[PDB]
């Protein structure tokens, strides 16, 4: 809430989960998946108790996905279906979540880096015409990940459902010539976990069953510190084998599919991706930077997003970096490794740091006028209102 | 406090402090860094420009501009920030209260003196000022009235003989060849090993290498074959990112340019001949007094082996009868400032100032009459 | 046949052929692709590695590795396959019979020259060899002894002035900014439209786009507003799968990095200032001769509008009296090889070789004495 009483809202508008809330909030108000589901008839399922609308959204769709044909509007940070994306924004601003009046509120949004421009122009075109938000801002996911951590200098690693991007900053000075994107995230893992479960005979071909495997991933799958030690456990023992019960009562068993699926963040060739993993990419992004800045990046590696919540990811990441520092910088001097100072900020609240940072920048700039972008400015200028941010559009 | 202030304003460093003191209070590099990116984090002391050690701390995100080059000031807007950073922030004194003593190399354009004196009054409102030659101040700190000084700094290298307080301007010689020309040459030969330094910040790293591992060879061609045979001179250096390098032959090839500028393409003669040729221009009577009282100054004269190579070469040119004695005190990197605190602390000097009213009536051209 | 062989070995391409000829016989990219899958179809010529045009034909299933980067060789095992592919397969000649003339950019590490000469003898058993600077050969093909060459290839960009066959090494400048740095920048701005190119094979596609649709703007800020208003520059390109794209503003923003490297974050100066700053380091007497005989080389100088933008910018810096004349022949993508066939066809050059016996007695370090 600003001086004028207008509520200041922060919506992440992610690719797999929406994180909406108000400024100054230390948690988010609602966290729900970004899917839209239309009704469908299937012979296996029989339900006539709960009313199924023609357009279900969010948590009331994923819960009832058995009777639905869900579809994600966003993919890899980019918006595909606008007519399904507006039905999501409505649910986000309606009596079921944040029962606000858009005409008397300020909004803060996020876009990932090196995305197209028409995806940013078309969002702002929508917030001022359809919802007629009073003040709008489109922030950078990296800079917000630092505000929550309380920093001015740190290489960011933000992995979500569709996008995995890396953005270095040094004392608040953006270095977009070092920004890198890996094309791997929680959705490219969820597909690889289906392709692995297919060897056991479990088939998850439908659109609803895609979420069911996400829950199987969020619960069981993890990252191996030393992948050789994990393979001995799967060959010599059978303790990794867990069990998951599905909504239809059928039980399954998941073993070495727990560390093999998310290893595609470090060995990405397993999903037909040419390149290097998140560690050898983060080390090569730093080695591109100016030589004086490198020392403070290793000390301030910041994680974020929900694809960094695999058990063992930061420890695995610290390991692979020191192997590369030893191999390429120190040329094999183990004795000097003790002096190598590296700290990977892995706070367990790293699941929502892009939102928390948006609560922080909003509360700091809620009561300023040169910051936001007004409806009046969009009526006069149009999409050229974005020049306030430095985004060259006409 | 009515103590006079002293400011060297060298090509690379700004040495400042009060009169009567034995060593300067503030020493910082003469650089002004402006950022090369767009700062989007607001309310974080993100200034439009940084000066001095505040730039070297942030050299990674800046373009370091040396406003002085070969003694001349190229950017006067940035140079005000230097002096403004000297008085208000480092020394923490107002300049209108005290006077100031500046320095300058010989054979500089007159427009450089005209502008400094114009700035101290019209901008800083100093009560008076004065402009001395850098080499002459080095002899005051040396406690002499007879001797030839060779001040070698970051941009300039000049010789000035004096005999009993009587300077011979016809024998003064200047040579635009100094540390910044050596730093650049070091970055060109380091490519041979495989080390590339291009950025201005990387130029400051190489400066730290030059002033930590480079020595002068008493016989260049002899040590050239030493390194080819053995690995004794191979010293190492740790970059801030943790990388490591090793330099052998490149430790004495960098300062040899002072004795062989043909490496840099310059047609000029070495410092060993310059100071000699200056002496040969003096009277035949006073040469012997200067062969003995041969003084060095400036940070560039802090190489190990510099005194022994000058003494060797000078002996080879001059007659065997004359005894060559080099004077190289362990504070010759600040000798020019030390003499300034001396010269301003004298009663005889209190009339050589150029007061506010004198500049008001004669304008900035008075500096040519008052300041020799 | 006793004809000498010539090999450029650029960062991106390998231009080869015989001496005395007017154009090279074999031109192929310097890449070595290794497969990224497991070949289960047996007896199907499934080799462990592919080289040259045989890789670009199979780029879909390979990881293309440029063994050279910014002029330096990073992988010597792969580079043997390049030369082995040049002699035995492309030229179809044994190397022990003929000599070979290699090339190299200035200010490279000495270990790069030491390794090439070691490889031609110990591996290929060549009778002799020689290593020339790439820019110097461009002037032989130009028919001059006075002029400054600006060779801009795939990884490196360097300037070399000469005056009557007398090269000024103190004025040579290098700049690690070339087509491969532009290709990567094009892939970063193409995301703005919605086109994603990450794979190495996709990097070769973007190369074909860069060398078919990108031009240089005589005034960048003027054409920037042209595209914002109209749709005249919007050219299209057909990908091999049948998809279609369209690029407007991105046609002249890619090569402008040569004139504004700040887009790439590089602190360096543009080619228009580099070649100028090189000339300012030459003697004041010979500047006018080089302002007229200003030559371009390398495939990167094949953009349309490159000659007019250099002439415009150089005129703006240099005095109005000096006449700026750019030389841009329609074969400047092979000028460095053409001069090599010339230089090896001379009687005076037959002594500058480094024979087998000379390398046997002095070792690979002889290249530093023989080859300048």
């Amino acid at each position: 809430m600003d001086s004028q009483g207008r509520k200041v809202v922060v919506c992440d508008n992610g690719t797999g989960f929406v994180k909406c809330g108000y400024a100054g909030s230390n948690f988010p108000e609602h966290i729900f998946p970004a899917l839209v589901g239309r009704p469908i008839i299937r012979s296996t399922t029989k339900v006539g108790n709960i009313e199924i609308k023609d357009l279900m959204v969010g948590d009331e769709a994923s819960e009832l996905r058995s009777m639905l044909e869900v579809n994600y509007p966003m993919e890899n940070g980019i918006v595909r279906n606008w007519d399904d994306m507006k039905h999501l924004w409505d649910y986000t601003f309606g009596p079921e979540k944040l029962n606000i009046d858009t005409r008397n509120c300020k909004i803060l949004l996020t876009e990932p880096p090196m995305n197209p421009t028409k995806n940013r122009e078309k969002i702002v075109e929508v917030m001022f015409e359809t919802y007629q938000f009073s003040g709008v801002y489109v922030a950078i996911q990296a800079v917000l990940t630092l505000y929550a951590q309380g920093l001015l200098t740190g290489v960011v690693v933000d992995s979500g459902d569709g996008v995995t991007h890396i953005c270095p900053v040094y004392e608040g000075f953006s270095l977009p010539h070092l920004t890198r994107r890996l094309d791997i995230a929680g959705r490219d893992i969820t597909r690889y976990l289906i392709k692995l479960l297919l060897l056991r005979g479990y088939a998850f071909n439908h659109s609803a069953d895609f979420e069911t495997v996400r829950m199987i991933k969020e619960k069981l799958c993890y990252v191996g510190y030393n992948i050789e030690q994990e393979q001995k456990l799967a060959l010599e023992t059978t303790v990794l084998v867990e069990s998951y019960t599905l909504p239809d009562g059928r039980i399954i068993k998941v073993g070495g599919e727990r560390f093999e699926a998310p290893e595609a963040l470090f060995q990405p060739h397993l999903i037909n991706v040419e390149g290097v993993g998140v560690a050898e990419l983060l080390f090569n992004t730093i080695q591109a930077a100016d030589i004086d800045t490198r020392s403070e990046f290793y000390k301030h590696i910041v994680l974020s997003g929900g694809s960094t919540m695999y058990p063992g990811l930061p420890s695995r990441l610290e390991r692979e970096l020191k192997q590369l520092y030893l191999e390429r910088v120190l040329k094999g001097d183990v004795e000097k490794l003790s002096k190598f100072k590296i700290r990977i900020e892995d706070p367990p609240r790293r699941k929502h740091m892009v939102f928390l940072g948006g609560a922080v920048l909003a509360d700091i700039m809620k009561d300023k006028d040169n910051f936001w972008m007004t409806r009046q400015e969009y009526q006069e200028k149009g999409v050229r209102v974005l020049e306030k941010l430095g985004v060259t559009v006409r | 406090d009515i103590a006079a202030l002293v400011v060297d304003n060298g090509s690379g460093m700004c040495k400042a402090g009060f009169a009567g003191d034995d060593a300067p209070r503030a020493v910082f590099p003469s650089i002004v860094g402006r950022p090369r990116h767009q700062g989007v984090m607001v309310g974080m002391g993100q200034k439009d420009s940084y000066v001095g050690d505040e730039a070297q701390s942030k050299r990674g995100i800046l373009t370091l501009k040396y406003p002085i080059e070969h003694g001349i000031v190229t950017n006067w807007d940035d140079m005000e920030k230097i002096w403004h950073h000297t008085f208000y922030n480092e020394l923490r004194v107002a300049p209108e209260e005290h006077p100031v003593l500046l320095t300058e190399a010989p054979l500089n354009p007159k427009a450089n003196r005209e502008k400094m004196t114009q700035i101290m009054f019209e901008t800083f409102n100093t009560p008076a000022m004065y402009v001395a030659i850098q080499a002459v101040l080095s002899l005051y700190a040396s406690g002499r009235t007879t001797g030839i000084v060779m001040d070698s700094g970051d941009g300039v290298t000049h010789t000035v003989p004096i005999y009993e307080g009587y300077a011979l301007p016809h024998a003064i010689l200047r040579l635009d060849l100094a540390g910044r020309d050596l730093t650049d040459y070091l970055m060109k030969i380091l490519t041979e090993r495989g080390y590339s330094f291009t950025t201005t910040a990387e130029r400051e790293i190489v400066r730290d290498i030059k002033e930590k591992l480079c020595y002068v060879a008493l016989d260049f061609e002899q040590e050239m074959a030493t390194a080819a045979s053995s690995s004794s001179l191979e010293k190492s250096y740790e970059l801030p990112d943790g990388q490591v390098i090793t330099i052998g032959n490149e430790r004495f090839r960098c300062p040899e340019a002072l004795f062989q500028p043909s490496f840099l393409g310059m047609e000029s003669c070495g410092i060993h001949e310059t100071t000699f040729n200056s002496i040969m221009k003096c009277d035949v009577d006073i040469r012997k007094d200067l062969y003995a009282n041969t003084v060095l100054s400036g940070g560039t004269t802090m190489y190990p082996g510099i005194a022994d190579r000058m003494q060797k070469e000078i002996t080879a040119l001059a007659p065997s009868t004359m005894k060559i004695k080099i004077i190289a005190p362990p504070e010759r990197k600040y000798s020019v400032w030390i003499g300034g605190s001396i010269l301003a602390s004298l009663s005889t000097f209190q009339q050589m100032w150029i007061s506010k009213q004198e500049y008001d009536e004669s304008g900035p051209s008075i500096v040519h009459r008052k300041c020799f | 046949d006793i004809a000498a062989l010539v090999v450029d070995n650029g960062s991106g391409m390998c231009k080869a052929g015989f001496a005395g000829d007017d154009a090279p016989r074999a031109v192929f990219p310097s890449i070595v692709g290794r497969p990224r899958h497991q070949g289960v179809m047996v007896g199907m010529g499934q080799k462990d590695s592919y080289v040259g045009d045989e890789a670009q034909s199979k780029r879909g299933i390979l990881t293309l590795k440029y063994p050279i980067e910014h002029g330096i060789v990073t992988n010597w095992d792969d580079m043997e396959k390049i030369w082995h592919h040049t002699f035995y397969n492309e030229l179809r000649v044994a190397p022990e019979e003929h000599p070979v003339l290699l090339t190299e950019a200035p200010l490279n590490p000495k270990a790069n020259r030491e390794k090439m000469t070691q490889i031609m003898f110990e591996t290929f058993n060549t009778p002799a060899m020689y290593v020339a600077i790439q820019a110097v050969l461009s002037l032989y093909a130009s028919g001059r002894t006075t002029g400054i060459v600006m060779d801009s290839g795939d990884g490196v960009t360097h300037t070399v002035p000469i005056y009557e066959g007398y090269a000024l090494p103190h004025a040579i400048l290098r700049l690690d900014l070339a087509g491969r740095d532009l290709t990567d920048y094009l892939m970063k701005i193409l995301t703005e439209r919605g086109y994603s190119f990450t794979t190495t094979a996709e990097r070769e596609i973007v190369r074909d786009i860069k060398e078919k649709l990108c031009y240089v703007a005589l005034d960048f800020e003027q054409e920037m507003a042209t595209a914002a208003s109209s749709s005249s520059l919007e050219k299209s390109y057909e990908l091999p799968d049948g998809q279609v794209i369209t690029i407007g503003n991105e046609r002249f923003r890619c090569p402008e990095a040569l004139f504004q490297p700040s887009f790439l974050g590089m602190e360096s100066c543009g080619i228009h200032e580099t070649t100028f700053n090189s000339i300012m380091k030459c003697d004041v007497d010979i500047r006018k001769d080089l302002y007229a005989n200003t030559v371009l080389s390398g495939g990167t100088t094949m953009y349309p509008g490159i000659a007019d933008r250099m002439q415009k910018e150089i005129t703006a810096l240099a005095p109005s009296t000096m006449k700026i004349k750019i030389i841009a022949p329609p074969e400047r993508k092979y000028s460095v090889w053409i001069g090599g066939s010339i230089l090896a066809s001379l009687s005076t050059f037959q002594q500058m070789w480094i024979s087998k016996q000379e390398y046997d007695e002095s070792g690979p370090s002889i290249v530093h004495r023989k080859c300048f």
Partner: peptide, 7 residues
């Protein structure tokens, strides 16, 4: 390269 730039 070894120091500065990659190569």
């Amino acid at each position: 390269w070894x120091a500065x730039c990659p190569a």
